[PDB]
Design a protein around this ligand. Structure first.
Ligand SMILES: NC(=O)C1=CN([C@@H]2O[C@H](COP(=O)(O)OP(=O)(O)OC[C@H]3O[C@@H](n4cnc5c(N)ncnc54)[C@H](OP(=O)(O)O)[C@@H]3O)[C@@H](O)[C@H]2O)C=CC1
Ligand SMILES: NC(=O)C1=CN([C@@H]2O[C@H](COP(=O)(O)OP(=O)(O)OC[C@H]3O[C@@H](n4cnc5c(N)ncnc54)[C@H](OP(=O)(O)O)[C@@H]3O)[C@@H](O)[C@H]2O)C=CC1
Ligand SMILES: NC(=O)C1=CN([C@@H]2O[C@H](COP(=O)(O)OP(=O)(O)OC[C@H]3O[C@@H](n4cnc5c(N)ncnc54)[C@H](OP(=O)(O)O)[C@@H]3O)[C@@H](O)[C@H]2O)C=CC1
Ligand SMILES: NC(=O)C1=CN([C@@H]2O[C@H](COP(=O)(O)OP(=O)(O)OC[C@H]3O[C@@H](n4cnc5c(N)ncnc54)[C@H](OP(=O)(O)O)[C@@H]3O)[C@@H](O)[C@H]2O)C=CC1
Lengths: 251, 251, 251, 251
């Protein structure tokens, strides 16, 4: 395709799972990809190596999210790492993908667990986007990775759903504000998606059967929607919540 | 009416504005109302006096929200204050009404301001509801006061909208979980509503014109919807987001 | 209550099922109710007798819907029947309740069946509302009875869902247009509701289990929401789609 | 791209406006395109010539919609026209694009005008899709062109909005039913879109300002979304309503 030819992307949690698929798709389409991660240096190196092997350009960016100064640390590492590539500052495509699950229903959730899922899932994207506005170019793309669970009730993950619900609400407000500069802002909401990290054949069967297609999502199913949203082909789609669940919750 | 005859209600921020209208309507309909507040002891006393003057029963409950132990402190004060009324423990109707605004667009929002609006608007209701489940009776009512701004983009208040968006997502998950005990969970979303705390005749005109009725909301417009949702007449309405904006954002 | 004291209501298909519950609730609250029907004169007489027995005022209005001149015939019979009561012309509350089911999936639907369900369910309400605007008073109420099936996919009734989907879209446009005269327009969407016309204990169990409350709806569950929407208590709710399904489709 | 290489598409009203842009985009990507139309033989010939000139394959299909036997006549002409191309029967991609406007508010709409807009906009697509199920292949695509007006109230076009609202409701029901064969069903909803058929500079300015981008849509903006939805890249998007309005109605 090369529909991201000459563009700079940042993918938060780009090292594994959906983030890795997004990182690899954007790079395969000609983007220079900042592969961000908080913990696993090795995973981040393999993902960059995979991209470089396939003929694309990527570099790691280390910043732990959900801690004091996380957003500032991420953009400092990005600016440094990016500068060290001999590219100019700023970016075209921001994907807030990094997130953590909290599989506890309301009676189980502690303050510590609640505070951590909001800090990573909601607070970090909010301040990451805030500082991106210093760097984000005209005709740019902001894409938040949310969850189908904001629109289909899942009591077992309620605090996680709420953290993604707050994130969903950032999209329309920013689409409106950034429209005059040709920037689009959109949410892509995955369903049950099979990553490198669904061992129970029984859970696998129940989650598969939730899709009208009778399968789990793959990272690639999400990355193919994100790549479209990030492209010029989606210039007329803004402020939206794009279901990437294989028809979960239809009937 | 007396459709809340013999029921115990808690209204968070019940001392002024929409909370006061809710408190007074529930009490006028026969509810015993816990009028909760964080700061203004005087306001809380006037509101209880107004209810007692009109023939109803209410008592103040002091707890500052958005601070360590807020939810535990609120339920301790409720249990104590309630016990001191010579009523039994527990409750029928929980209204999470207390909230604070943050009128700053994304480029303006500080960590401190963001953290405070989430702590009061989202975190406190979440842990308040969690501890209510020890006390909340069969056929009970949970009602969250949200904002029209979660569904109609208002960049100027983006972090406030996000805090209400997280709260919106708690409603369906809890409606599903609590259905088997006849409890309903619903969100009521006010529009531009004129409280005791809209001095600019120009802002007043612009916000009035947002309604298909060409006026600002009054606390009473919200309280009349909340009272219905809290009643047996709304037994078949659960998990919903009830627009109480006078038709803001229709076209 | 008497919250409809001195008001004139028309309920289409008011003779049985949800229409009968609406008719009886509005009359019990002091409304003069036009009980409209297309076919069963006897049912319409029993419903009016039931209202008159309980101390309320109602009269039958015969008009077959889904035929040439149906809307004109209904308003002619209403104006005549109403005039014969010695009340003045016009009305306060219009409920489009009359409808027919089409339980055939897409591969089964004939032109005749499709045309008939649209004629009764969509076309008749549209022209009925059009002629109501000559008669409908300030502060009035228009309420459409839709179906949960417009928002939760039910392939087995697809053409019926589409007919209700068109009806759903009339509500916001009219709420906007009629706001300046204090008229509200709203949709109430029933779920699986047990009428006089669910014999299979197996279908009964499956439809019951669709509700978070583990029961079928009763006409009264719908009528209690409609009566609220029709009242001054709902003056600030307009253009909305009110779920009256007992939490069908939440998760 | 060639992401429609070897696929057969039918585009209803493919001869001009959005239909022509869709027809040309699908053909440029390797689809064999049936360019359907009801009236203007010349327009249909120019559109096919444009495609053939650019290196693609298309053929005209004449059928007037909104008349007795329209769906049967369209598929007879398609099967004949298609057969005459020396391709096998059946298809991969169905776009219901053909539609007519009705710019009259409720007080203005006649039975004839109402009946005609439903016949073309709703009835024809419904029976066209019904007969497509005899021909539509595994992994296929059904795409309905709706209107932003189903979700943002436009009293001036109310009967048109209702016709598109019924069409919107066909999408989820069919997505659910056809999921097991890998077929996706989606609605694409254009905003104010500038076609060959917006002469008033004043209307042009007002409609432009409705978009967060301060311009009218172009056919190409819609065609780029439709082409994505029709492709393997959108395999995980089904039952959805895709806003192609340039952010109309966000705030
Ligand atoms: N998989 C699924 O079924 C679903 C996924 N989602 C959402 O999709 C997104 C991607 O999920 P998925 O692919 O499953 O996740 P994985 O857990 O597979 O990958 C998570 C990524 O985020 C990074 N990350 C995690 N926590 C932090 C942190 N505190 N600071 C910095 N980076 C962090 C990880 O790097 P590192 O380990 O080095 O920190 C890694 O790159 C998430 O937002 C998730 O909520 C939504 C619906 C369901
Ligand atoms: N008015 C409007 O136009 C709109 C209102 N809303 C929402 O409606 C709800 C009611 O708003 P409104 O009537 O305007 O508010 P007011 O500010 O008039 O009243 C706020 C109430 O909440 C209490 N409260 C505030 N902060 C705290 C705190 N930290 N701890 C404990 N109690 C607290 C206040 O008591 P004390 O001062 O003693 O702390 C008071 O009783 C809020 O959730 C608001 O966001 C939504 C849309 C618009
Ligand atoms: N019951 C349920 O589970 C559900 C009901 N609904 C909707 O709720 C509404 C009420 O349904 P319900 O109570 O079950 O219906 P019933 O069939 O019990 O009652 C139908 C009523 O409409 C009248 N009616 C029917 N067809 C015509 C016609 N052609 N002309 C004039 N009057 C007519 C009937 O009178 P007569 O027989 O004399 O013509 C009768 O008063 C309908 O719009 C229905 O689609 C939606 C979701 C599910
Ligand atoms: N343009 C806009 O701003 C908007 C458009 N839309 C929708 O997008 C779709 C495309 O609209 P647009 O490009 O503007 O339309 P145009 O009127 O430019 O093109 C209409 C097309 O449909 C065909 N058509 C029209 N009526 C019939 C009929 N009775 N039988 C058969 N074919 C027919 C026409 O061919 P022929 O003339 O030969 O019959 C032509 O190919 C429509 O469904 C429209 O409602 C929605 C929102 C706004």
């Amino acid at each position: 395709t090369q529909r991201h030819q000459g563009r700079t992307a940042l993918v938060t949690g780009g090292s594994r799972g959906i983030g890795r698929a997004i990182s690899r798709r954007l790079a395969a389409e000609g983007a220079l990809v900042a592969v961000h991660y908080g913990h696993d240096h090795a995973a981040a190196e393999r993902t960059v190596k995979e991209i470089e092997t396939d003929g694309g350009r990527a570099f790691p960016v280390h910043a732990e999210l959900g801690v004091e100064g996380d957003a500032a640390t991420l953009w400092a590492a990005f600016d440094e790492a990016l500068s060290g590539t001999g590219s100019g500052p700023g970016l075209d495509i921001l994907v807030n993908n990094a997130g953590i699950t909290l599989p506890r229903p309301i009676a189980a959730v502690t303050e510590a667990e609640y505070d951590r899922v909001f800090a990573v899932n909601t607070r970090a994207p909010f301040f990451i986007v805030q500082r991106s506005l210093e760097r984000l170019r005209d005709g740019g793309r902001i894409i938040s990775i949310s969850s189908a669970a904001t629109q289909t009730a899942y009591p077992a993950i309620v605090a996680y759903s709420m953290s993604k619900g707050a994130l969903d609400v950032l999209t329309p407000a920013l689409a409106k504000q950034l429209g005059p500069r040709g920037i689009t802002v959109n949410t892509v909401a995955p369903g049950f998606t099979e990553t490198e990290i669904l061992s129970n054949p029984e859970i696998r069967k129940a989650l598969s059967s939730a899709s009208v297609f009778g399968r789990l999502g793959a990272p690639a199913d999400i990355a193919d929607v994100v790549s479209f949203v990030a492209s010029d082909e989606a210039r007329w789609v803004t402020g939206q919540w794009i279901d990437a669940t294989g028809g979960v919750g239809l009937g």
